[PDB]
Amino acid sequence: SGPVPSRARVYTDVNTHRPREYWDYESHVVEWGNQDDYQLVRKLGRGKYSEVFEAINITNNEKVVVKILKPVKKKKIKREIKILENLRGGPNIITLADIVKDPVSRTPALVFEHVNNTDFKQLYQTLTDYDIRFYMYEILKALDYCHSMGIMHRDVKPHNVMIDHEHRKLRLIDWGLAEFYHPGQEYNVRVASRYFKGPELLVDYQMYDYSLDMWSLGCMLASMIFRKEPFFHGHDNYDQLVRIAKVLGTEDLYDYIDKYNIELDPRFNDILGRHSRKRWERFVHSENQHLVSPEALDFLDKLLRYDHQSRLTAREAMEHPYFYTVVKDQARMG
Numbered sequence: 001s002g003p004v005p006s007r008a009r010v011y012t013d014v015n016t017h018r019p020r021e022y023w024d025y026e027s028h029v030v031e032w033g034n035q036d037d038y039q040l041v042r043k044l045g046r047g048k049y050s051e052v053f054e055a056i057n058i059t060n061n062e063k064v065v066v067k068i069l070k071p072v073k074k075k076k077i078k079r080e081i082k083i084l085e086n087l088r089g090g091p092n093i094i095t096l097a098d099i100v101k102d103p104v105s106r107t108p109a110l111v112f113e114h115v116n117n118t119d120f121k122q123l124y125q126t127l128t129d130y131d132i133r134f135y136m137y138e139i140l141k142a143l144d145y146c147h148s149m150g151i152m153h154r155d156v157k158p159h160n161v162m163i164d165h166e167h168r169k170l171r172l173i174d175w176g177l178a179e180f181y182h183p184g185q186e187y188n189v190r191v192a193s194r195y196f197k198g199p200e201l202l203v204d205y206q207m208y209d210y211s212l213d214m215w216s217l218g219c220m221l222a223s224m225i226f227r228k229e230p231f232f233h234g235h236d237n238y239d240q241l242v243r244i245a246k247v248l249g250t251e252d253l254y255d256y257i258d259k260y261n262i263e264l265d266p267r268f269n270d271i272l273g274r275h276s277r278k279r280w281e282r283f284v285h286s287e288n289q290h291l292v293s294p295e296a297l298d299f300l301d302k303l304l305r306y307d308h309q310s311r312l313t314a315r316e317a318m319e320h321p322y323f324y325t326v327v328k329d330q331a332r333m334g
């Protein structure tokens with residue numbers, strides 16, 4: 001009949017136990033400031049519905065980042081603001097500093113702490129084995145925190161991880177697709193970016209949870225240790241699942257589809273084929289072997305699972321042997 005329901009393994013009911021105001025972002029009241037407190041310096045980039053600038057706060061002469069919002073869906077503005085406010089001060093989460101509107105155009109804009117960034121298309125080429133572990137651990141702190149706060153990021157990818165490599169500091173940005181987890185809710189599956197979409201999104205299983213972010217993180221890890229960007233390189237959403245099935249195999253895929261009684265789109269009927277689950281040594285060569293270890297492969301394998309329930313949680317991930325050296329060095333504070 002219908003799809004089998006599902007619930008997050010961790011942090012299942014945390015929003016239910018909050019006051020309504022925590023997650024009911026539609027009724028949040030915004031105190032809009034004056035963008036004239038800020039002078040734009042230069043354009044830094046763009047989002048799917050935003051343009052991002054370096055700016056100067058002319059009151060205290062501090063450098064900030066201004067994100068001007070022009071979304072197709074409007075209530076998305078209060079959602080992002082409310083999620084950013086709930087998460088403010090959490091480890092490795094971008095800090096929302098102010099919320100303003102241009103006095104003329106009335107266009108809303110978010111003001112953030114400034115962070116430097118090197119584009120991952122030139123930074124990841126220089127990361128050592130240790131650096132990958134260190135920064136993966138920093139991302140996991142951010143994800144464990146926001147999951148523990150009842151929030152799925154739903155857009156984890158290199159472009160959304162700002163790294164100041166000189167100061168070894170990392171921030172997870174762009175919370176515009178983030179959402180509150182509520183058990184039993186059916187979410188939009190047209191989230192995240194193609195190369196980082198979890199199988200639940202590709203097969204249209206809507207009752208997903210925080211474990212979506214852990215798939216995306218596994219895609220990032222695979223591209224870093226194997227030096228293959230992206231790791232799953234699909235032409236479209238349907239071929240994206242084919243690329244995954246050629247690596248993880250079709251047996252576990254059809255068991256997953258069976259377990260949740262998922263109705264598979266007929267387009268997949270003639271393109272998934274039959275594929276074995278490949279051993280990870282198949283992707284190791286002389287150019288990436290210094291980043292690959294038994295610990296790295298054991299950790300990666302535990303993130304990239306079809307069944308979202310069987311993926312590591314962020315906190316389970318942080319206890320994996322792959323991070324023992326980072327944990328020990330963090331304790332002695334170095």
Ligand SMILES: CC(C)=CCOc1cccc2c1-c1c(c3c(n1C(C)C)CCCC3=O)C2=O
Pocket residue numbers: 044045046047048050052065067094112113114115116117159162173174175
């Ligand atoms: C120094 C350089 C070149 C980049 C640092 O870019 C920062 C720094 C602090 C804070 C943020 C960004 C940023 C944000 C956002 C984006 N970017 C960048 C990637 C343009 C892209 C769109 C979505 C979004 O939200 C954001 O909140």
Ligand code: NA
Pocket residue numbers: 047048159160174
């Ligand atoms: Na983005």
